[PDB]
Design a protein around this ligand. Structure first.
Ligand SMILES: [Ca+2]
Length: 207
């Protein structure tokens, strides 16, 4: 939603680490300083890697965010992201995010990164058919059936997981970069029809 009157940053963003991020973004002197919606409207990018952030509550008030870099934090819940309709790039590596339902309405999302989140179920990704690049390296994924729906992907990383069957990738003709090292892949027939592959990594398979 939005704030109708000047309000302290610390009152909108509960997480003190995140509050500091917003303060820095708006070039404010303190998280205790007051901010207006006009000021919150100015944020289209948040860079806060390894910032010890546990919650992004309050981010719902930033309607124009398109880029969000939150790698290496302590996130678990991303429900606050649900209505950030303009999100185009979302990097959330090194967190503990598993509920991907909050991403279902991010129809402008082109790049998503969720490496090292201990994820095994990615069926919620079906709601992002427009995705162009997806990074899911270092997780516990085995079933990638849902990926057959992501026909716009040109870059995909699934390295360091527990995948055996890559047939779901057979129809992703736009793929140019495919990272599949450190998995359990034996059958590579699914790669036959991928006419645009430039980069392909398949080393260290354990069968
Ligand atoms: Ca606080």
């Amino acid at each position: 939603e939005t704030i109708t009157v000047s309000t302290p940053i610390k009152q909108i963003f509960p997480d003190d680490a995140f509050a500091e991020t917003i303060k820095a973004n708006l070039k404010k002197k303190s998280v205790t300083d007051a901010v207006t919606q006009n000021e919150l409207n100015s944020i289209d990018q948040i860079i806060a890697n390894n910032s010890d952030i546990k919650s992004v509550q309050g981010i719902q008030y930033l309607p124009n965010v398109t880029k969000l870099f939150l790698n290496g934090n302590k996130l678990t819940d991303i429900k606050p992201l649900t209505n950030l309709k303009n999100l185009g790039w979302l990097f959330l590596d090194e967190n503990k995010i598993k509920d991907l339902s909050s991403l279902k309405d991010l129809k402008k999302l082109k790049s998503l990164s969720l490496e090292h989140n201990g994820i095994s179920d990615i069926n919620g990704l079906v709601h992002l058919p427009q995705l162009e690049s997806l990074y899911l390296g270092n997780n516990k994924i085995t079933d990638i059936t849902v990926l057959s729906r992501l026909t716009k992907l040109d870059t995909l990383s699934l390295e360091d997981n527990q995948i055996s069957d890559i047939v779901p990738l057979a129809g992703l003709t736009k793929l140019q970069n495919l990272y599949l090292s450190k998995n359990h892949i034996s059958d590579l027939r699914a790669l036959a029809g991928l006419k645009n592959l430039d980069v392909l990594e398949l080393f260290s398979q354990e069968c």
